[PDB]
Write a protein that binds this ligand. Structure first.
Ligand SMILES: CC[C@H]1C[C@H](C)[C@@]2(NC1=O)O[C@@H](C[C@H](O)[C@@H](C)CC/C=C/C=C(\C)[C@@H]1C/C=C/C=C/[C@H](O)[C@H](C)[C@@H](O)[C@@H](CCC(C)=O)C(=O)N[C@@H](C(C)C)C(=O)N[C@@H](Cc3cccc(O)c3)C(=O)N3CCC[C@H](N3)C(=O)O1)[C@H](C)[C@H](O)[C@@H]2C
Length: 164
């Protein structure tokens, strides 16, 4: 069965709520496994304690840099970077979970959650999951973003792990 992972989001240390994701291990197993493992922290590093460094209202929320914490870092469980698995899934609407990158075959740990349909990204970013529960929490996170993506408050992943 496709795994389920959760993020407990905090704003300036205050609990905001929980967002759960279904990871499409059936279509993009390598990419899904990377995100799952980084969520549990089983490899010794991962998302817990990292922040969402770029939030653009009406577009997406981006995070995952747990190494440099300034938007340029992150790494995968397979090494520094890994290849684009496939582009079977599309950015069809709000709740889509997809990989950020710096060009072809540069996936690390950074990801983004879409809050709208984003067709232009199809074929450039690997879609590997979707919000299962807590879309209202993602919508609340958008309130702290801006055009440039800079956040007004510190939005962190206070806790994370695998549910199912
Ligand atoms: C008139 C406004 C316009 C835009 C707004 C936002 C809007 N509509 C609009 O009409 O967008 C639309 C959606 C658009 O149609 C979309 C789908 C297409 C147009 C794309 C817009 C993209 C953006 C506004 C932002 C711009 C951010 C640029 C950031 C640049 C960084 O300086 C640079 C990327 C840097 O951080 C380097 C550092 C390298 C190093 C080792 O030092 C880098 O490569 N960083 C990577 C990390 C993973 C390492 C990174 O962050 N990569 C980005 C690259 C990227 C940049 C732009 C477009 C891409 O497809 C991809 C990345 O993967 N993401 C994830 C996807 C979004 C993107 N950031 C982003 O923030 O994209 C939505 C539906 C809605 O209507 C809103 C209002």
């Amino acid at each position: 069965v496709n795994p389920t992972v959760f993020f407990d989001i905090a704003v300036d240390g205050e609990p905001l709520g929980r967002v759960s994701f279904e990871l499409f291990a059936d279509k993009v197993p390598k990419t899904a496994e990377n995100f799952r493992a980084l969520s549990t922290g089983e490899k010794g590093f991962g998302y817990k304690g990292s922040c969402f460094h770029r939030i653009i209202p009406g577009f997406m929320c981006q995070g995952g840099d747990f190494t440099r914490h300034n938007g340029t870092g992150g790494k995968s469980i397979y090494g520094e970077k890994f290849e684009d698995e496939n582009f079977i899934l599309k950015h069809t609407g709000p709740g889509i979970l997809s990989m950020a990158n710096a060009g072809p075959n540069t996936n690390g740990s950074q990801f983004f959650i879409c809050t709208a349909k984003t067709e232009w990204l199809d074929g450039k970013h690997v879609v590997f999951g979707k919000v299962k529960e807590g879309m209202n929490i993602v919508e609340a996170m958008e309130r702290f973003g801006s055009r440039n993506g800079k956040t007004s408050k510190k939005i962190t992943i206070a806790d994370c792990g695998q549910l199912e």
